[PDB]
A paper describes a structure:
An example of a protein activated by PKA is the cystic fibrosis transmembrane conductance regulator (CFTR), an epithelial anion channel crucial for salt–water balance of the lung, intestine, pancreas, and sweat duct. CFTR gating (opening and closure of the pore) is under tight control by its regulatory (R) domain, a mostly unstructured segment containing 10 consensus PKA-C phosphorylation sites. Phosphorylation by PKA releases the R domain from its inhibitory position, permitting ATP-induced dimerization of its nucleotide-binding domains (NBDs) to open the channel. The PKA-C consists of a small N-terminal lobe (N-lobe) and a larger C-terminal lobe (C-lobe) joined by a flexible linker.
Author numbering:
A (entry chain G): 13 to 335, 345 to 351
B (entry chain A): 3 to 108, 118 to 402, 437 to 645, 844 to 886, 910 to 1121, 1125 to 1173, 1207 to 1436
The structure:
């Protein structure tokens, strides 16, 4: 306490001013490159570029204006831009400049050369328990900060997590993030981590992302999704059933922690009853963790991806390349 | 699926859903498929997950892991919900006599009688539906605990796995298999009894005001007397246990060695020894039974004292109205029921349950095996300075290796002296303190002693994986399994039984190889796979799978063959716990060429049971005579008095039927004594009969199927049966006497009692069929659980190395559900029967009460007084009858055993010899004829290795054989088998020595002089051997004579044969079991002392039997003959 509460209050006060005065059109599409396409994604494209004036490499996002209107996805990107321009924490991708063109919108974000954690999990298959705990601690910390900012992430799947040179997780893809004070209602996200509250088409509370964390922990510690099915409709029925079949090599402490993070009962769901995160942070499974050192990045990472220079794209996949009133604050 | 889910509330209250099973089973035999589907709440998985979640919450919450604190938050509320209704159903019974005490007032009485009926009607519905729920809760806890213990049985490390005994787990599991389920109906009486006695004492104070503690103190001291006698019983039982052990070991010894005794004709000797052993057993059993009879009769006797003492002080000071006697008698019997039997039962149940729960809690905290951080990715498996102890003694001397992806190393050295330990360390089963062994994590092992799980060969080779046509075909073809499949029964899906006995050792090796090759893994640690196959088969396997297919991926085989190491990409030879030589193929081969060369229930059963002893009929008619005399005397005195204070006091004698009809101490003892004598006589006769059965009939009986009739049936016949039948006869006698007394006092009761008896008999007969069928089905449905547990405990290493635990967990859950269906259905039908019997008693009580009230002061009081309290004794009698009917099966089986029929000059002649193992099997001999020379050895040659034990056994007529034998001019028919078998002497491969002193072990009949025996022993060359024994000859050959060597045992057998002065000596396997010094000494002794005996040496080697003069050739179904070696070696062997 004490220091943590003061830090949270200072962060909220600073974020209020940033949300009050967002910028727009900070750069033009004339000082970047087209070395490679890092990845397309949901409905866009992202390419790796380098600063022409400076030399530092920066990731650039691209979104089609017609697609946003056609998919009825206009407010989400507008709010995501403000969230990115206002968020400030060690575990989030930092945005440098934004661009607005008559054809597509662009924005500059810091590049993480470690690649997607989904590929690492798939190649390795499954992690050891301390390795999973090392990531769960960072995820819990960033969720603490984000909840202290009165926002909801609502989209937490492994391919949206990146690794940096030091080996820590950087969280990206804030497109579905919404600053909601109270009960939400919008249905979206990924079927695998769709919480039982959202599946029933009811007002989602702040505990919707807790189920996402409880599913990501199982996916990282097992190697297969804890809830899987052939079809999304069948997957919806399986999630509604709420019966989980744990593997044999799972420890007792993790078996206890996972049960609370995935309980159907909203009242008894962990991290929502009385403490918020203080119950989870004090759990036995997290007993061997230096949170003060985790915040200061003073603990050596148990995994370092092979970095081969700023221009290296070895970890990232290689697949080809590339060649009005709705938006007014971009 | 289960009919419980689809049932009316009335049916669920009246157990109406159990009708169809009774309807079907009474008329036709049940099929196991007819058992109803388990309720979805009672599935093993559903309870296991719940209890496991509570238990791991307890583990992760506090540092005081109390398992009962996890059972509480699971079952406490339903437990209390049922306990409340149990309390109310007891309170109504306790408070009922207050209505009777007001009924005796005589109009208004009809309403009071209706109210009296209402209480019984309510109690009928308030007790049983809660008892059934308590039993259901017990079943749930038992299922969940069993599932948890099995789920933890696949997590222990080998460090603590080998330390525990095999029998510990099975003893703990079977200890509470039925105790826990029925140990809940008496659980609530730990707090219902004290409140009951408090209410009753207060109410009796509201009627006496001066004398309450007087009876309660007497009840208390009686209770401590009864409890204290238990220790006296337990001491005698503990003393008897060791004697039963030492008798049973000898009985098993002779059961195993039946044929040796038959050849030696030692039946009467062991008859005498067994009787001598059993005499003291009978003494102790009789003392324990007398103590038990005293303890049982104390409760029956105290029923009069407990009310006499309560009434006496108030009676002397003030006169007492008859109301305050007929009310205090009922309150007093209720108190006696509540404080003498229920409360100690509840205390015992609580103590045992707490002990079992604490044992389970202790078990669930053992050392746990930890899986390696594996399955991720790895280069060449590398071990660097691995050092660990196989138990201080380092089994690994800082070994180091690195096998590239595809290379096939080959460890060599002593078996299990470092190769197996290194393989286990690589597999991660043993944690290495020093070093870091890194592996890909996908490891498929293949132990030297392969284990075959029960099921089909396809099931034992698929291991819960798909049947890839190309992969399975290649595995079958390469591992020599294609020919075995072509020779298999179903040829693709031959369903083998448990244990793999139907398969050969090479078949087991092929199965292990197929299992190892099935799994796709980055390391296939096939340890000693080729140790059970032929040399050509080994070469074919190497050229097919090991060095053809399994060499594509990384593989670390362990073979001692010189040719196998030739193809190895690396060699690591280890010996004496250290790596003697290591390196590449050529480098290690040329490192030291010199070292390289050096290295390489019917009525008939009843009447038969009573008619075994004439004293039993005498004592039973005696007891019946005293019974009818005493009931007649009581009836006549009741009539005289009903048609000075002591005159009214005498009613207390007749009021409590227990004391008035109690079996006197002068009558119960002869019954128990006669039953013990009957059991002794039956055991002796059955032992006599089993020792004379024909061998062919005995062959049909499995070896384990006879020892059980000695170890379990006799104990049941001695301990459980006598007390059960005594209690049943006493309870039935009490019931019939009381009902006759009621009927005589009012002659219109008889017309109501007759249909009651008819319906009693009809209902009991109806329920018995289904009860017994379900009992047998449940009993036969319990073996697979233990079989699977033992199989998993044996296969643990391969099971965990492969990584297929959930398959086994689901199999165990399926078996548990299979047994639970039968158990739950039987419990439900038992509760149904109990409730129906309560209802019929209730309607009988309605009839008697109304007919009594509608039509003096003593009449109605006595009638109602017996009427209200007969019920407990009646229910006890019915339950005892069902228990004795259950117990009659042991008597039936023993009687099935008793009626088994019995079997029926030096020159000798044989002709028309026809023999077979059974009656009508393959002819071992087909009219084989031979002539025995006088004193000339005839070697057993010809068909050596085809099996000559049959001919040797038939020579003594110890098998199903027929023909003509003429030895010394006497036919085999006229000479008695007891007399004929003594002349012939045999030397069996296994020598049987009786567990006892040398004089007894060598002279069971003890018909020879000690000096003569010593002289014979000196002449047999065993004097020096016996000189090292303790004492002179009294050293008991305990443990079946394990002290003596095999050669010493053979010499002792030869000396015993010489003592019998047998005319022939059919020595078999002389040098097979004898050491070279022992064989030479035996041959010299046979040449010197046994020169005059017509011996016939049997040996596979022709050279060994070449010393014999004659050479009796042998062949399939025809005994050839070549008396001279000049033609035997040229025609018989060539
Ligand atoms: N700052 C970055 N550094 C490196 N790779 C990045 C970065 N931002 C994105 N990427 C990669 O580029 C790919 C596509 O960009 P992304 O942010 O995921 O757009 P998106 O459509 O909104 N993602 P999603 O909705 O989950 O499918 C991602 O898979 C990332 O692996
Ligand atoms: Mg995307
Ligand atoms: Mg994304």
């Amino acid at each position: 306490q004490e220091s943590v509460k003061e830090f949270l209050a200072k962060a909220k006060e600073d974020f209020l001013k940033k949300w009050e005065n967002p910028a727009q059109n900070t750069a033009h599409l004339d000082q970047f490159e087209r070395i490679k396409t890092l990845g397309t994604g949901s409905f866009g494209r992202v390419m790796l570029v380098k600063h022409m004036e400076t030399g530092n490499h920066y990731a650039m996002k691209i979104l089609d204006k017609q697609k946003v209107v056609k998919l009825k996805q206009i407010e989400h990107t507008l709010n995501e831009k403000r969230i990115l321009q206002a968020v400030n924490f060690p575990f989030l991708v930092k945005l440098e400049f934004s661009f607005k063109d008559n054809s597509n919108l662009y924005m500059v974000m810091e590049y993480v050369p470690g690649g997607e954690m989904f590929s690492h999990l798939r190649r390795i298959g499954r992690f050891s328990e301390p390795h999973a705990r090392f990531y769960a601690a960072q995820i819990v910390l960033t969720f603490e900060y984000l909840h202290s900012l009165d926002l909801i992430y609502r989209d937490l799947k492994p391919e949206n997590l990146l690794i940096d040179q030091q080996g820590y997780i950087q969280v990206t893809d804030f497109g579905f993030a919404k600053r909601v004070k109270g009960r939400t209602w919008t249905l979206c996200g990924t079927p695998e981590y769709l919480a039982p509250e959202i599946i029933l088409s009811k007002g989602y509370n702040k505990a919707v992302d807790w189920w996402a964390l409880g599913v990501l922990i199982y996916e990282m510690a097992a190697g297969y999704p804890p809830f899987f099915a052939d079809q999304p409709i069948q997957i919806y029925e399986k999630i509604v059933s709420g019966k989980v079949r744990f593997p044999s090599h799972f420890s007792s402490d993790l078996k206890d922690l996972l049960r609370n993070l995935l309980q159907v009962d909203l009242t008894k769901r962990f991290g929502n009853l009385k403490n918020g995160v203080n119950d989870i942070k004090n759990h036995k499974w997290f007993a061997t963790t230096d949170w003060i050192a985790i915040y200061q990045r003073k603990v050596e990472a148990p995994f370092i991806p092979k970095f081969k220079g700023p221009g290296d794209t070895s970890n990232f996949d290689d697949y080809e390349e590339e060649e009005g009133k709705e938006f007014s604050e971009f | 699926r289960s009919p419980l889910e689809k049932a009316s509330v009335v049916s669920k209250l009246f157990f109406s859903w159990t009708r169809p099973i009774l309807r079907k089973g009474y008329r036709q035999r049940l099929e196991l498929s007819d058992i109803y589907q388990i309720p979805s709440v009672d599935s093993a998985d559903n309870l296991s997950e719940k209890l496991e979640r509570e238990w791991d919450r307890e583990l992760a919450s506090k540092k005081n892991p109390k398992l009962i604190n996890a059972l509480r938050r699971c079952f406490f509320w339903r437990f209390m919900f049922y306990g409340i209704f149990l309390y109310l159903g007891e309170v109504t019974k306790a408070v009922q006599p207050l209505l009777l005490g007001r009924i005796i007032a005589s109009s208004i009485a009809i309403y009071l009688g209706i109210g009296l009926c209402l209480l019984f009607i309510v109690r009928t519905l308030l007790l049983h539906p809660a008892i059934f729920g308590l039993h259901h809760i017990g079943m749930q806890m038992r299922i969940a605990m069993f599932s948890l213990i099995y789920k933890k049985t696949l997590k222990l490390s080998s460090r603590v796995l080998d330390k525990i005994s095999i029998g510990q787990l099975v003893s703990l599991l079977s200890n509470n298999l039925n105790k826990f389920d029925e140990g809940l109906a008496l659980a609530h009486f730990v707090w219902i009894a004290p409140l009951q006695v408090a209410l009753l004492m207060g109410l009796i104070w509201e009627l006496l005001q001066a004398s309450a503690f007087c009876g309660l103190g007497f009840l208390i001291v009686l209770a401590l007397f009864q409890a204290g006698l238990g220790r006296m019983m337990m001491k005698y039982r503990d003393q008897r246990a060791g004697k039963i052990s030492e008798r049973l070991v000898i009985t098993s010894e002779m059961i195993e060695n039946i044929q040796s005794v038959k050849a030696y004709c030692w039946e009467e000797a062991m008859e005498k020894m067994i009787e001598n052993l059993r005499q003291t057993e009978l003494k102790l059993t009789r003392k324990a039974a007398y103590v038990r009879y005293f303890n049982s009769s104390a409760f029956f006797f105290s029923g009069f004292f407990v009310v006499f003492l309560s009434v006496l002080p108030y009676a002397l000071i003030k006169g007492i109205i008859l109301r305050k006697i007929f009310t205090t008698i009922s309150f007093c019997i209720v108190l006696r029921m509540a404080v003498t039997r229920q409360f100690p039962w509840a205390v015992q149940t609580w103590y045992d349950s707490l002990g079992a729960i604490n044992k389970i809690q202790d078990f669930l905290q053992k050392q746990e095996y930890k899986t390696l951080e594996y399955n991720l990715t790895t280069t060449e498996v590398v071990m660097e300075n691995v050092t660990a102890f196989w138990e201080g003694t380092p089994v690994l001397k800082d070994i180091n290796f690195k096998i590239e992806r595809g290379q096939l190393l080959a460890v060599a050295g002593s078996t299990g002296a470092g190769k197996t330990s290194l393989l286990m360390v690589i597999m991660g089963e043993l944690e290495p303190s020093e070093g870091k062994i890194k592996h890909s994590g996908r490891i498929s092992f293949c132990s030297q002693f392969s284990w075959i799980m029960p099921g089909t060969i396809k099931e034992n080779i698929i291991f819960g994986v798909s049947y890839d046509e190309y992969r399975y075909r290649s595995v079958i073809k390469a591992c020599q399994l294609e020919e075995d499949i072509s020779k298999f029964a179903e040829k693709d899906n031959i369903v083998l039984g448990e244990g793999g006995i139907t398969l050969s050792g090479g078949q087991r090796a092929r199965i292990s190889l197929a299992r190892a090759v099935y799994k796709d893994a980055d390391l296939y640690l096939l340890d000693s796979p080729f140790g059970y196959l032929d040399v050509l088969t080994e070469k074919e396997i190497f050229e097919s799978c090991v060095c053809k297919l399994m060499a594509n991926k990384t593989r670390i085989l362990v073979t001692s063959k010189m040719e196998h190491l030739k193809k190895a990409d690396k060699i690591l030879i280890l010996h004496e716990g250290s790596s003697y030589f290591y390196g590449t193929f050529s480098e290690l081969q040329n490192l030291q060429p010199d070292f390289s060369s050096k290295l390489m229930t019917t009525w008939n059963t009843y009447l038969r049971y009573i008619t075994v002893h004439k004293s039993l009929i005498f004592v039973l008619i005696w007891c019946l005579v005293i019974f009818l005399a005493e009931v007649a005397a009581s009836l006549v005195v009741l009539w005289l008095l009903g048609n000075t204070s002591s005159y009214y006091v005498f009613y207390i004698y007749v009021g409590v039927a227990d004391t008035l009809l109690a079996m006197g101490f002068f009558r119960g003892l002869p019954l128990v004594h006669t039953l013990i004598t009957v059991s002794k006589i039956l055991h002796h006769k059955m032992l006599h009969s089993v020792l004379q059965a024909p061998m062919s009939t005995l062959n049909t009986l499995k070896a384990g199927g006879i020892l059980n009739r000695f170890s379990k049936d006799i104990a049941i016949l001695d301990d459980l049966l006598p007390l059960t039948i005594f209690d049943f006869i006493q309870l039935l006698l009490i019931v019939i006497g009381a009902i006759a007394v009621v009927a005589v006092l009012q002659p219109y009761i008889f017309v109501a009692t007759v249909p009651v008896i008819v319906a009693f008999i009809m209902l009991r007969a109806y329920f018995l069929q289904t009860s017994q069928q379900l009992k047998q089905l449940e009993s036969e449905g319990r073996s697979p659980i233990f079989t699977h547990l033992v199989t998993s405990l044996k296969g643990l290493w391969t099971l965990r190395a492969f990584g297929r635990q959930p398959y086994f967990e689901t199999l165990f859950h399926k078996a548990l559900n299979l047994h639970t269906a039968n158990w739950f259905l039987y419990l439900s039908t038992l509760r149904w029967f109990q409730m129906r019997i309560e209802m019929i008693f209730v309607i009988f009580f309605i009839a008697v009460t109304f007919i009594s009230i509608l039509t003096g002061e003593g009449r109605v009081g006595i009638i109602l007084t017996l009427a209200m309290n007969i019920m407990s004794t009646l229910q006890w009698a019915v339950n005892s009858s069902i228990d004795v009917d259950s117990l009659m099966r042991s008597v039936s089986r023993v009687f099935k055993f008793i009626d088994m029929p019995t079997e029926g000059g030096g020159q000798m002649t044989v002709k028309d010899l026809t023999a077979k193992y059974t009656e009508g099997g393959n002819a071992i001999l087909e009219n084989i004829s031979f002539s025995i020379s006088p004193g000339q050895r005839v070697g057993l040659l010809g068909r050596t290795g085809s099996g000559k034990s049959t001919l040797l056994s038939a020579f003594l007529r110890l098998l199903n054989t027929e023909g003509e034998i003429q030895i010394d001019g006497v036919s085999w028919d006229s000479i008695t088998l007891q007399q004929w078998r003594k002349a012939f002497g045999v030397i069996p491969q296994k020598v049987f020595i009786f567990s006892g002193t040398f004089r007894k072990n060598l002279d069971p009949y003890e018909q020879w002089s000690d000096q003569e025996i010593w002289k014979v022993a000196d002449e047999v060359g065993l004097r020096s051997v016996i000189e090292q024994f303790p004492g002179k000859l009294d050293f008991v050959l305990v443990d079946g004579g394990c002290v003596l060597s095999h050669g010493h045992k053979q010499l002792m057998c030869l000396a015993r044969s010489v003592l019998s002065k047998a005319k022939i000596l059919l020595l078999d396997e002389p040098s097979a079991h004898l050491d070279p010094v022992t064989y030479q000494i035996i041959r010299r002794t046979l040449k010197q002392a046994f020169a005059d005996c017509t011996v016939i040496l049997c040996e596979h080697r022709i050279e060994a039997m070449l010393e014999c003069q004659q050479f009796l050739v042998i062949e399939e179904n025809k005994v050839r003959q070549y008396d001279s070696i000049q033609k035997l070696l040229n025609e018989r062997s060539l």
